[PDB]
Design a protein around this motif. Structure first.
Motif, PDB file in Angstrom:
ATOM      1  N   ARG D  62       8.093   7.721  -4.364  1.00 29.21           N
ATOM      2  CA  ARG D  62       9.253   6.922  -4.031  1.00 29.21           C
ATOM      3  C   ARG D  62       8.823   5.864  -3.034  1.00 29.21           C
ATOM      4  NH1 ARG D  62       9.775  11.580  -7.025  1.00 29.21           N
ATOM      5  NH2 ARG D  62      11.928  12.271  -7.135  1.00 29.21           N
ATOM      6  N   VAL D  63       8.991   4.605  -3.401  1.00 24.61           N
ATOM      7  CA  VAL D  63       8.568   3.512  -2.546  1.00 24.61           C
ATOM      8  C   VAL D  63       9.448   3.466  -1.315  1.00 24.61           C
ATOM      9  CG1 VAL D  63       8.302   1.041  -2.378  1.00 24.61           C
ATOM     10  CG2 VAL D  63       7.614   2.224  -4.410  1.00 24.61           C
ATOM     11  N   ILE D  64       8.913   3.899  -0.226  1.00 21.55           N
ATOM     12  CA  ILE D  64       9.603   3.893   1.049  1.00 21.55           C
ATOM     13  C   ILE D  64       9.343   2.566   1.724  1.00 21.55           C
ATOM     14  CG2 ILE D  64      10.127   5.242   3.059  1.00 21.55           C
ATOM     15  CD1 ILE D  64      10.212   6.909   0.601  1.00 21.55           C
ATOM     16  N   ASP D  65      10.332   2.112   2.479  1.00 20.90           N
ATOM     17  CA  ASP D  65      10.234   0.899   3.268  1.00 20.90           C
ATOM     18  C   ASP D  65       9.977   1.328   4.701  1.00 20.90           C
ATOM     19  OD1 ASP D  65      10.321  -1.575   4.399  1.00 20.90           O
ATOM     20  OD2 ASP D  65      12.448  -1.915   4.008  1.00 20.90           O
ATOM     21  N   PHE D  66       8.705   1.424   5.040  1.00 17.84           N
ATOM     22  CA  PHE D  66       8.267   1.670   6.397  1.00 17.84           C
ATOM     23  C   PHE D  66       8.073   0.386   7.183  1.00 17.84           C
ATOM     24  CE2 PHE D  66       6.540   5.623   4.459  1.00 17.84           C
ATOM     25  CZ  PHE D  66       7.351   6.467   5.148  1.00 17.84           C
ATOM     26  N   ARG D  67       8.487  -0.745   6.629  1.00 12.59           N
ATOM     27  CA  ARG D  67       8.161  -2.060   7.146  1.00 12.59           C
ATOM     28  C   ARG D  67       9.402  -2.930   7.127  1.00 12.59           C
ATOM     29  NH1 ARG D  67       5.447  -5.837   4.167  1.00 12.59           N
ATOM     30  NH2 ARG D  67       4.708  -7.604   5.408  1.00 12.59           N
ATOM     31  N   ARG D  68      10.478  -2.408   7.698  1.00 13.73           N
ATOM     32  CA  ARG D  68      11.811  -2.973   7.528  1.00 13.73           C
ATOM     33  C   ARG D  68      11.944  -4.218   8.392  1.00 13.73           C
ATOM     34  NH1 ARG D  68      15.301   2.178   8.839  1.00 13.73           N
ATOM     35  NH2 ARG D  68      16.977   0.671   8.560  1.00 13.73           N
ATOM     36  N   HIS D  69      11.272  -5.276   7.951  1.00 11.50           N
ATOM     37  CA  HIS D  69      11.191  -6.531   8.670  1.00 11.50           C
ATOM     38  C   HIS D  69      11.886  -7.685   7.977  1.00 11.50           C
ATOM     39  CE1 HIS D  69       8.167  -7.223   5.621  1.00 11.50           C
ATOM     40  NE2 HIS D  69       8.057  -8.479   6.009  1.00 11.50           N
ATOM     41  N   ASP D  70      12.176  -7.567   6.687  1.00 15.56           N
ATOM     42  CA  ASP D  70      12.642  -8.674   5.869  1.00 15.56           C
ATOM     43  C   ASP D  70      14.123  -8.592   5.551  1.00 15.56           C
ATOM     44  OD1 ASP D  70      12.183  -6.403   4.466  1.00 15.56           O
ATOM     45  OD2 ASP D  70      11.371  -7.387   2.681  1.00 15.56           O
ATOM     46  N   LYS D  71      14.865  -7.753   6.261  1.00 16.42           N
ATOM     47  CA  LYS D  71      16.274  -7.515   6.000  1.00 16.42           C
ATOM     48  C   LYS D  71      17.037  -7.482   7.306  1.00 16.42           C
ATOM     49  CE  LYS D  71      16.128  -7.440   1.672  1.00 16.42           C
ATOM     50  NZ  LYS D  71      15.380  -8.679   1.984  1.00 16.42           N
ATOM     51  N   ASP D  72      16.640  -8.331   8.241  1.00 12.57           N
ATOM     52  CA  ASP D  72      17.258  -8.349   9.555  1.00 12.57           C
ATOM     53  C   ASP D  72      18.604  -9.046   9.488  1.00 12.57           C
ATOM     54  OD1 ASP D  72      14.970  -7.120  10.492  1.00 12.57           O
ATOM     55  OD2 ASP D  72      14.860  -8.378  12.283  1.00 12.57           O
ATOM     56  N   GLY D  73      19.635  -8.370   9.985  1.00 10.37           N
ATOM     57  CA  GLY D  73      20.988  -8.856   9.894  1.00 10.37           C
ATOM     58  C   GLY D  73      21.637  -8.636   8.556  1.00 10.37           C
ATOM     59  N   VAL D  74      20.900  -8.118   7.586  1.00 12.26           N
ATOM     60  CA  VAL D  74      21.402  -7.854   6.252  1.00 12.26           C
ATOM     61  C   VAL D  74      21.677  -6.363   6.207  1.00 12.26           C
ATOM     62  CG1 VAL D  74      20.830  -7.769   3.851  1.00 12.26           C
ATOM     63  CG2 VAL D  74      20.292  -9.783   5.141  1.00 12.26           C
ATOM     64  N   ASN D  75      22.939  -6.001   6.352  1.00  3.84           N
ATOM     65  CA  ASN D  75      23.295  -4.607   6.435  1.00  3.84           C
ATOM     66  C   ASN D  75      23.072  -3.922   5.096  1.00  3.84           C
ATOM     67  OD1 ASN D  75      23.966  -5.069   9.047  1.00  3.84           O
ATOM     68  ND2 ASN D  75      26.136  -4.602   8.817  1.00  3.84           N
ATOM     69  N   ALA D  76      23.121  -2.600   5.129  1.00  2.00           N
ATOM     70  CA  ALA D  76      23.060  -1.791   3.931  1.00  2.00           C
ATOM     71  C   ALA D  76      24.017  -0.634   4.094  1.00  2.00           C
ATOM     72  CB  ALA D  76      21.659  -1.261   3.674  1.00  2.00           C
ATOM     73  N   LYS D  77      24.271   0.055   2.994  1.00  2.00           N
ATOM     74  CA  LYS D  77      25.003   1.303   3.011  1.00  2.00           C
ATOM     75  C   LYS D  77      24.157   2.362   2.341  1.00  2.00           C
ATOM     76  CE  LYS D  77      28.699   0.091   0.808  1.00  2.00           C
ATOM     77  NZ  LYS D  77      28.081  -1.257   0.893  1.00  2.00           N
ATOM     78  N   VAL D  78      24.147   3.546   2.935  1.00  2.00           N
ATOM     79  CA  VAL D  78      23.394   4.651   2.369  1.00  2.00           C
ATOM     80  C   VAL D  78      24.087   5.062   1.085  1.00  2.00           C
ATOM     81  CG1 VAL D  78      22.457   6.903   2.743  1.00  2.00           C
ATOM     82  CG2 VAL D  78      22.684   5.361   4.619  1.00  2.00           C
ATOM     83  N   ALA D  79      23.456   4.754  -0.035  1.00  2.00           N
ATOM     84  CA  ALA D  79      24.038   5.065  -1.322  1.00  2.00           C
ATOM     85  C   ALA D  79      23.795   6.508  -1.693  1.00  2.00           C
ATOM     86  CB  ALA D  79      23.459   4.158  -2.385  1.00  2.00           C
ATOM     87  N   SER D 118      19.675  -3.570  10.576  1.00  2.00           N
ATOM     88  CA  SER D 118      18.282  -3.871  10.840  1.00  2.00           C
ATOM     89  C   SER D 118      18.216  -5.156  11.636  1.00  2.00           C
ATOM     90  CB  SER D 118      17.491  -3.991   9.546  1.00  2.00           C
ATOM     91  OG  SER D 118      17.583  -2.806   8.779  1.00  2.00           O
ATOM     92  N   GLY D 119      17.433  -5.138  12.694  1.00  2.00           N
ATOM     93  CA  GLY D 119      17.154  -6.300  13.493  1.00  2.00           C
ATOM     94  C   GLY D 119      17.376  -6.031  14.951  1.00  2.00           C
ATOM     95  N   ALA D 120      17.242  -7.091  15.740  1.00  2.00           N
ATOM     96  CA  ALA D 120      17.381  -6.989  17.181  1.00  2.00           C
ATOM     97  C   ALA D 120      18.828  -6.836  17.601  1.00  2.00           C
ATOM     98  CB  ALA D 120      16.791  -8.226  17.841  1.00  2.00           C
ATOM     99  N   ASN D 121      19.743  -7.446  16.860  1.00  2.00           N
ATOM    100  CA  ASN D 121      21.158  -7.411  17.173  1.00  2.00           C
ATOM    101  C   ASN D 121      21.870  -6.253  16.498  1.00  2.00           C
ATOM    102  OD1 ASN D 121      20.630  -9.776  18.583  1.00  2.00           O
ATOM    103  ND2 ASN D 121      21.132 -11.051  16.817  1.00  2.00           N
ATOM    104  N   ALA D 122      21.141  -5.203  16.155  1.00  2.00           N
ATOM    105  CA  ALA D 122      21.701  -4.031  15.516  1.00  2.00           C
ATOM    106  C   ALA D 122      22.209  -3.043  16.551  1.00  2.00           C
ATOM    107  CB  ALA D 122      20.659  -3.353  14.640  1.00  2.00           C
ATOM    108  N   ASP D 123      23.128  -2.196  16.114  1.00  2.00           N
ATOM    109  CA  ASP D 123      23.638  -1.141  16.964  1.00  2.00           C
ATOM    110  C   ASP D 123      22.653   0.009  17.002  1.00  2.00           C
ATOM    111  OD1 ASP D 123      25.139   0.452  18.572  1.00  2.00           O
ATOM    112  OD2 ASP D 123      26.810   0.698  17.179  1.00  2.00           O
ATOM    113  N   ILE D 124      22.668   0.726  18.117  1.00  2.00           N
ATOM    114  CA  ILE D 124      21.722   1.819  18.340  1.00  2.00           C
ATOM    115  C   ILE D 124      22.373   3.059  17.746  1.00  2.00           C
ATOM    116  CG2 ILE D 124      20.328   3.025  19.981  1.00  2.00           C
ATOM    117  CD1 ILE D 124      19.804  -0.020  19.718  1.00  2.00           C
TER     118      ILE D 124
END
Lengths: 131, 32, 69, 275
Positions: D62-79, D118-124
């Motif tokens: 399963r291709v895991i994204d261990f490099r979550r750098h290209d989706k900053d500010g682009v939210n997701a939902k756990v499907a 994802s990103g700097a302006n994300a919630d903790i």
RNA sequence: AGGAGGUAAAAAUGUUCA
RNA sequence: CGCAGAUAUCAGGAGGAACACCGGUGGCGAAGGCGGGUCUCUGGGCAGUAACUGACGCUGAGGAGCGAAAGCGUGGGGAGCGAACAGGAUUAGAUACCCUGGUAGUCCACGCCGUAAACGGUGGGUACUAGGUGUGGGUUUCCUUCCUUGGGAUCCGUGCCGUAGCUAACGCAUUAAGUACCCCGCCUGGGGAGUACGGCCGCAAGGCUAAAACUCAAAGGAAUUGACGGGGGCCCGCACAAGCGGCGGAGC
RNA sequence: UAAUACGUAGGGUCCGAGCGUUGUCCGGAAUUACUGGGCGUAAAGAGCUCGUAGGUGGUUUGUCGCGUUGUUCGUGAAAACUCA
């Protein structure tokens, strides 16, 4: 909780007679009033009033003491208790204090002493000994 | 009351529990 | 309103005890920064308990010191 | 959690298994499924390099994204939350609002519908990925990069986590799962929270066959080998080795970390033993 | 009247009837 | 332990546990027990009102649940303390007291256990029977400062004292160990023994139920008089201390 | 070593064709207490609650007459016991 107001009445009487009180107020019951009448007639109390309370009715027994504070009663003893009801036939009625006492007997001729019960030839529930 | 009555029971219990600790494995091999 | 009966907080100067009113809580503190007992203040148990809780909250928010010295 | 099997067979007496409870889907996402083939612990030469490997159930990566750098500010939902045989943790299938579907390590507390930032302006929050410059101290994090852009290396296994102790400069201090404190560039990214499936450790695999399915071949002890095979070998009757413990290649017990390494200056405190 | 804390380290036993 | 730079001191950091003062003959809880703060959720109680139901109450065999601490399991954690353990010391010996360390454990999560001087050594409920004095919570009321923990009345508590009464006595004494009623549990001489056998529970530890043989003519409770105390207080004595002179060593 | 407790003598006493012992039962033993006990320290309050069965039940009207009580009949064999 309360389980026999007869014993409650006898105990209020006994404790007040021990403390040399002159009055005993308590709740009212027709049976307690009849008992008080027996005690009055046999001379163990001075009088008894039936008055009204905030909710129901009260008995006010005016007790009796001699001139030197002689307790007119020397003892009270419930006999037919709940849990153990004792009934006396006309023959084997109890002699309280060798006869100098008084046993309260509830019969269908009413509430009457052991003397009266032996006279009338009847018996029943032995409520108290009130020497 | 007195503590002699405690001490008698104490000694009885102490000796019994010592006996049990001493016979623990024997008792297991027998019971179980 | 003397020491054995000085519950001013029930009688007069009846101040709602607050963790912000350090001007109030300073009188219920020692020079060493410790809470004064009822036997010295004069407060009822309710007001003493409220003062104590006030002082502790104020200490947690640095409006008062824990171990003043 | 854990499902303790009942002792209907001696191979199932004390055995346990995961109650795949936080899992929602038996099937993976086909677009993110690369193939895999076993190696047998064998390298390019065809020779066993790592022993005690092989057999094993077939698997798929399963291709895991261990490099979550290209989706900053682009939210997701756990499907979904899914099983991964390649790892102890479970994996969360995220649907990015831009239509990208990706897999992550499935932290603890995470469920379907939870929104991942994802990103700097994300919630903790659990699952949210941030730079350590933006994560505050005393925070529990996982899937940490050792280098900016290098991808998550640290705190990836089940139930595990890293405690961010402090940030002094361009270096953030991290208590690692081993207890090792080390410094890492604040630019490195970490996923907030602790990894899920922490119950995994408490599984009793019950029988040899189960580890043969997991791809663990039998481990033979040296004391029952011959001296030609193992230093501990030999002896008429049992032996404890006849010498101090060593590997099959005679290397003794002791620190094998190469000294004079670059990481020695980033490391603050090696882990502890015995205490 | 009003107001901190202390020290004596260890040092056992007792045939007879009574 | 240090002299390889300890102790001490200053600064910074990590982590764990417990929460000084408030805090007490105080409060809450059925008991166990509960003490940093905040938030969330939640239980019980008390007073007043008398709107409601209309004896629906009390107790409770068995049963179920809760149940300090230690302990057990699994998984974490582990600063301090600390069984065990190890040294040191004391000692005739010291598997001890003391010291230095120090493991489990103490802590958390989920569960087992199910005991304790779990004690008020006092089952629960109800009614009555002198008062005084504190204190906690609440209602009202009267002097009125109309300040007001000024006082009073009343309900619920919690303490001390003290009658009557009770008690073997100690003591209890409106929070009864009094006067009485209901229900439950328990006792029937001391040991053996809360042990064995059996059974149940329990991972185990062990717990619960629970004997008999045999044995003793007592075991016991309270209080009195003495004696004693490596208990206290006061006081004495060539008792010690301060001194002088001796004995013990020689010969007789 | 000075025995009214042993043994024997006298003497006394209790019974008397019996007297003593043993065994068994009751009593004394209010020592399983219904009559007729208790549980702070004597043995004795479950560690505490919840609650099932059960036990118990405030004031009051009427009724049933089950308990209760009175009276009567039958029975309660004879013997026994008791009175004469």
């Amino acid at each position: 909780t309360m389980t026999d107001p007869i014993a409650d009445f006898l105990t209020r009487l006994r404790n007040a007679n021990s403390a040399y009180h002159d009055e005993v107020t308590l709740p009212h019951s027709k049976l307690k009033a009849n008992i008080a009448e027996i005690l009055k007639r046999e001379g163990y109390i001075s009088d008894y009033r039936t008055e009204d309370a905030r909710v129901g009715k009260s008995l006010v027994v005016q007790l009796k003491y001699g001139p030197s504070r002689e307790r007119s009663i020397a003892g009270l003893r419930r006999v037919s208790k709940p849990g153990l009801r004792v009934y006396a036939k006309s023959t084997n009625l109890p002699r309280v204090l060798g006869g100098l006492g008084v046993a309260i007997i509830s019969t269908s001729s009413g509430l009457l002493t052991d003397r009266q019960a032996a006279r009338q030839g009847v018996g029943g529930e032995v409520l108290a000994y009130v020497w | 009351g007195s503590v002699i009555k405690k001490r008698r029971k104490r000694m009885s219990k102490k000796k019994h529990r010592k006996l049990l600790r001493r016979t623990r494995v024997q008792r297991r091999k027998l019971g179980k | 309103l003397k020491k054995p009966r000085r519950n001013q907080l029930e009688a007069l100067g009846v101040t709602t005890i607050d963790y912000k009113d350090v001007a109030v809580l300073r009188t219920f503190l020692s020079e060493r920064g410790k809470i004064r007992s009822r036997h010295v203040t004069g407060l009822t148990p309710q007001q003493q308990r409220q003062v104590a809780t006030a002082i502790k909250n104020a200490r947690e928010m640095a409006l008062l010191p824990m171990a003043g010295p | 959690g854990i499902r303790k099997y009942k002792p209907t067979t001696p191979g199932r007496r004390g055995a346990s298994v995961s109650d795949f409870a936080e899992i929602t889907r038996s099937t993976p996402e086909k677009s993110l499924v690369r193939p895999l083939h076993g190696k047998g612990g064998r390298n390019a030469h065809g020779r066993i390099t790592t022993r005690h490997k092989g057999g094993g159930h077939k698997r798929a990566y399963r291709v895991i994204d261990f490099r979550r750098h290209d989706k900053d500010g682009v939210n997701a939902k756990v499907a979904h939350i899914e099983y991964d045989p390649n790892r102890t943790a479970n994996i969360a299938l995220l649907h990015y609002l831009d239509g990208e579907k990706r897999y992550i390590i499935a932290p603890q507390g995470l469920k379907q519908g939870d929104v991942i930032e994802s990103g700097a302006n994300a919630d903790i929050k659990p699952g949210n990925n941030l730079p350590l410059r933006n994560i505050p101290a005393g925070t529990v994090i996982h899937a940490v990069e050792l280098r900016p852009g290098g991808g998550a290396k640290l705190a990836r296994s089940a139930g595990v986590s890293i405690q961010l102790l402090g940030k002094e400069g361009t270096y953030a201090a991290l208590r690692m799962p081993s207890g090792e404190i080390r410094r890492v560039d604040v630019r490195c990214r970490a996923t907030v929270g602790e990894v899920g499936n922490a119950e995994q450790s408490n599984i009793n695999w019950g029988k040899a066959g189960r580890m043969r399915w997991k791809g663990k071949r039998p481990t033979v002890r040296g004391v029952v080998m011959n001296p030609v095979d193992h230093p501990h070998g030999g002896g008429e009757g049992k032996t404890s080795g006849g010498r101090h413990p060593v590997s099959p290649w005679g290397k003794p017990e002791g620190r094998t970390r190469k000294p004079n390494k670059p990481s020695d200056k980033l490391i603050v405190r090696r882990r502890r033993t015995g205490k």
